[PDB]
Structure formats: structure tokens, C-alpha cells
Amino acid sequence: MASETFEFQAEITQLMSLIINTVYSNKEIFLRELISNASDALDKIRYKSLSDPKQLETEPDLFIRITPKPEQKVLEIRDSGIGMTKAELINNLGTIAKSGTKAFMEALSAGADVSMIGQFGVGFYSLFLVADRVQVISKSNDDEQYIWESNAGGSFTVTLDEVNERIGRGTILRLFLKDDQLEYLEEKRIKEVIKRHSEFVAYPIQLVVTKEVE
Ligand SMILES: CCc1cc(-c2[nH]nc(C)c2-c2ccc3c(c2)OCCO3)c(O)cc1O
Numbered sequence: 001m002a003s004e005t006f007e008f009q010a011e012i013t014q015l016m017s018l019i020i021n022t023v024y025s026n027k028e029i030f031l032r033e034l035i036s037n038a039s040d041a042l043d044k045i046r047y048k049s050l051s052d053p054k055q056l057e058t059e060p061d062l063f064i065r066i067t068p069k070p071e072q073k074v075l076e077i078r079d080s081g082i083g084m085t086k087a088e089l090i091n092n093l094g095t096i097a098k099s100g101t102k103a104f105m106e107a108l109s110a111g112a113d114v115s116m117i118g119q120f121g122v123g124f125y126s127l128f129l130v131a132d133r134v135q136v137i138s139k140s141n142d143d144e145q146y147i148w149e150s151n152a153g154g155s156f157t158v159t160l161d162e163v164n165e166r167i168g169r170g171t172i173l174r175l176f177l178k179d180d181q182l183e184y185l186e187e188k189r190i191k192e193v194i195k196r197h198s199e200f201v202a203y204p205i206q207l208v209v210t211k212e213v214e
Helices: 010-021 029-049 053-058 086-094 098-110 114-120 123-129 187-197
Strands: 004-007 064-069 074-079 131-139 146-150 155-160 170-177 205-207
Touching: 004 086, 010 098, 010 123, 029 053, 029 064, 029 074, 029 114, 029 123, 029 170, 029 187, 064 187, 086 131, 086 146, 086 155, 098 114, 114 123, 123 131, 187 205
Parallel strands: 064 205
Antiparallel strands: 004 155, 064 074, 074 170, 131 146, 131 170, 146 155
């Protein structure tokens, strides 16, 4: 189907521009922020299910799963959290981050470390440290599966999903890695980053590794 195009709140476009271009050394912090967001979304579906247990039935398994796709230079981070409807994708990713992004950029101006980004509630955008494009594929129990896409420019698209694997419920962040950040496709590197900055996660963190049978 046809994609619909939307404009980001301008301060989010400013933040994306700063992040995709920064020469900040510690780019690996992106993974912590995305694992944190995944964990939060899983918190949300668990909490919602306390009073509406059927909500878990679309995907009873609660997990965070990381899949490198070397041939496409893609890294996927999936969770079986609450997901986002079309309206939530438009709102959560293109609008509500306006306030945090403004305050965070002022902090960056003054010398704050880019790693503080999560404390300003806008850690999602740290993916542009390693990626130049992202598709957020999401399925909420309350809507169809949709794809939100951004290349850090001022507009994003949202498209009903007729091309990706069905998610039972949850979200996949599909990161198209920059040419000099392909280390994040490697098994050893990924495990090293996770072990370092994400030790207290309540959900299993699965790593999908592809190997040749010899
Ligand atoms: C914002 C990026 C993102 C969102 C989700 C997700 N799925 N469903 C919801 C309600 C969310 C979400 C939304 C806002 C947010 C989140 C998670 O983490 C704390 C900060 O702000 C997700 O599951 C993964 C992910 O990377």
C-alpha cells in the first residue's frame, strides 16, 4: 500500500541531525538505550495484563531479541512489548520527544555527555550514532502491523506492513548501519556491549547467530 508522510517536530529533526553527525567516541551506548526502551515496553504489556490477561495471548513469550543481518548491513532489536498503533508511532516517534530533545540539546551545548540522552527521555534517537536509517515495525494488539521509517531527515513515513514477518505483538527496530559501524553485526562485539551496560534487565536478551555447519 501507499505510504503516508509526516513532518517531525522541528526540535526532533535538530536532535537527529546532531546525533547522526557527531563524532562522539562511545557510539556503543545506543544499544543500552534501545534495550532500555524494549524493557519499558515489555513492562507496559506485563502491567496492562494484570487486569486484562488476554492481552498477552498474541505473544505469550516476553523477550528482547537481537538479530544481525550482515548481508543487508542491518541490526534488528525486537521486543514482545506492548507495541505501537499507527497513531502511537506517529505521536511517540515524531512528536512527544520535542520537550526532551530541546532540553538535551541545551545540555549538549554546555558539555553534557551524549550518553545522558536517556535521562532526557529521548534515547531512541541515539540509534543515529550507528545507523543512517531506521524502520520501526510495530504491532499493538489494538491495530494492524505498521512500518515507521526515518533517515534522520525532517519527514518520516508510516506504511501498513505487507512486507515483513508478522510480529505477534511488539516492535522491531531495524537499524541500517553506517558503513564504518559494521562491528555491531559481530556476535562477540554485541555480547560485550550488552554485558557492559545492560546487567539488570528483567527479560531474557536473546542473540540470534547464524553459523555455517562444517
Ligand atoms: C521509542 C522507541 C521504542 C519504543 C518501543 C515501544 N513499543 N510500545 C511502546 C509504548 C514503546 C515505547 C514508547 C516510548 C518510550 C519507550 C517505549 O521506552 C522508553 C522511552 O519512551 C519499543 O518497544 C522499543 C523502542 O525502541
